[PDB]
């Protein structure tokens, strides 16, 4: 996360770290959506241009974390993966269209002060909140700048950007399964996700019921926090039919 701040304790209790077994290293962010299911970006698991194609046994998820590097004894919980599900129409070839994946845990994780699931948006909450100017929050342990790494979880609040502005900022083909967020060059404030934040959540707090909803997944950007560029996020609601299908048939 670029130009963010240290998270407060328990600020993002749905935050999940995707952790490589060997070598032991951070792979990505992710989010807890129930006691057995974790949501992330497809490119965290499958990205052929970078020779990335992880299997279940390659990975762990670490839940309830704050420190990036410490083993947080008595606080974090570490889970093995039973199964990975990637969206069947995930487009890793071109533009990361439908950049979404689910991971089912081998065993349910116990909730605590530091571990708690985020909500997924219904159609109405999505319609109400996914509007240009409305801010969401992005969290992760990724790089602090494009060209370094945080001691603890970072957080940054960023405004959703008008779709034409998103489109005009890039040569990449944007789709309805993405939205973009970030400040404009003139606005003064700045901030962005960066490498390592991939797969983490873009959340919004509904003013209707005071619950946190995951509207987006950290997906892609040209560099990090570049003027005139924006961060692109998987549109969780647009792909919720797939999410529900997977959970309903495999859990």
């Amino acid at each position: 996360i670029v130009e963010g701040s240290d998270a407060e304790i328990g600020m993002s209790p749905w935050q999940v770290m995707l952790f490589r077994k060997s070598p032991q290293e951070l792979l990505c962010g992710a989010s807890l959506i129930s006691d057995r299911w974790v949501l992330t970006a497809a490119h965290c698991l499958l990205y052929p241009p970078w020779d990335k194609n992880f299997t279940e046994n390659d990975l762990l998820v670490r839940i309830g974390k704050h420190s990036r590097t410490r083993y947080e004894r008595n606080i974090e919980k570490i889970s093995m993966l039973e199964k990975i599900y990637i969206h069947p129409r995930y487009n890793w070839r071109e533009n990361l269209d439908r950049d979404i994946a689910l991971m089912k845990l081998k065993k349910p994780v116990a909730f605590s002060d530091y571990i708690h699931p985020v909500c997924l948006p219904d159609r109405e909450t999505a319609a109400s909140l996914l509007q240009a100017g409305y801010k969401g929050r992005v969290t992760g342990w990724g790089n602090l700048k494009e060209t370094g790494q945080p001691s603890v979880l970072q957080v940054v609040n960023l405004p959703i950007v008008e779709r034409p502005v998103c489109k005009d900022s890039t040569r990449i083909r944007i789709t309805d399964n993405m939205f973009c967020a970030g400040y404009k060059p003139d606005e003064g404030k700045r901030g962005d996700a960066c490498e390592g934040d991939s797969g983490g959540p873009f959340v919004m707090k509904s003013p209707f019921n005071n619950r946190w909803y995951q509207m987006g997944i950290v997906s892609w950007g040209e560099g990090c926090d570049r003027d005139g560029k924006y961060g692109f996020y998987t549109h969780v609601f647009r792909l919720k039919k797939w999410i529900q299908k997977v959970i309903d048939q495999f859990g």
Binding site: Q24, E25, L60, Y71, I78
Partner: peptide, 11 residues
Amino acid sequence: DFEEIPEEYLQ
């Protein structure tokens, strides 16, 4: 850079 995690999770 990372602190080692308990072996039980790598077994």
